[PDB]
Amino acid sequence: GISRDSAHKRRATGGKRKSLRKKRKFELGRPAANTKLGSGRVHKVRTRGGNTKLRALRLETGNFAWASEGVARKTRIADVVYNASNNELVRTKTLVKNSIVVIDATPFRQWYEAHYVLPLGRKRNPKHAQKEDENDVLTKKRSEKVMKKYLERQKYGKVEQALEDQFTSGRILACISSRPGQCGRSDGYILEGKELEFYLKKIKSKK
């Protein structure tokens, strides 16, 4: 294998410090995940003894947080549009850390209608004019405190219009925050404020 030490790499002015204790077991690193977006597989391996680090391969889904509240919802990752550095990881569609991935916009719609009674996004009327079962679970009037609690609530549904265009189309972007190669998950959060409006210039203008 190849170790992760300084066995290579001539010292600071050019010359070659040659050998000095050829090899050690602990000082090595293994071949990486290279996790394509797939159908959710996983593998177990020994680490430095006792610890069980879990890597990911051929992964499908994950749970992803929200910005202004920290609302973590699990949903199927659809696809990818962008990775941060290696375009030769973009084209093969490989799951890495904090790359620009589009996910779902589905479960955040139904989860939020307690606080965000106005449904996000605006679904098409004349084919979805029937409710299965939307309009009753929006308000219901409750004859009680919770609808009255939702009156001083829904004062925070002043969200960004760009995701409101994106929620009504049903494909939101997000940023997978955790490490795929340390715990075997795809855990993240939606980019909302400033890097959301930034990276579309990195995508739609380069489209």
Partner: protein, 155 residues
């Protein structure tokens, strides 16, 4: 210096725009938790209201300054966010009880809050975590930086 020029996006990790629902309104006049070293060194005022990102910055990154603390002089500053400083000392021989002019050279990293450091300015130095293959220090304070003769004066 930066208008966030990067092929990815750069941001100080650990903060988020939380907009309406909040315990009170903790504006803090900027969403940037600027820490301090607290070892007697005053913080630079530009660090708190900075737009620079600099994950390896000792004030604003995932860094806590460790080790010892020293002073010295700087020679080269071409490389990015990184200057080339120089220290002086002596050596005690056995044959003569006499001394010499030898020196070492440690390359060091800069936050851009000490923008425009030149030859031969005077810069104190403090230690931190390894950055990349040589850099285990970080610049503390432009303390004097004054050559009253050749370097530090306009013309």
């Amino acid at each position: 210096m930066a208008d966030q020029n990067e092929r990815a996006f750069q941001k100080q990790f650990g903060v988020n725009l939380n907009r309406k629902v909040k315990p009170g309104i903790t504006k803090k006049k900027l969403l940037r938790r600027s820490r301090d070293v607290g070892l007697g060194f005053k913080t630079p005022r530009e660090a708190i209201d900075g737009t620079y990102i600099d994950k390896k910055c000792p004030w604003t990154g995932d860094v806590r300054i460790r080790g010892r603390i020293l002073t010295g002089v700087v020679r080269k500053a071409k490389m990015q966010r990184t200057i080339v400083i120089r220290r002086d000392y002596l050596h005690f021989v056995r044959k003569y009880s006499r001394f010499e002019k030898r020196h070492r050279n440690m390359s060091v990293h800069c936050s851009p809050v000490f923008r425009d450091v030149e030859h031969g300015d005077i810069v104190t130095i403090g230690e931190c975590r390894p950055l990349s293959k040589t850099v285990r220090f970080n610049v503390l304070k432009v303390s004097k930086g004054q050559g009253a003769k050749k370097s530090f004066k306009k013309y």
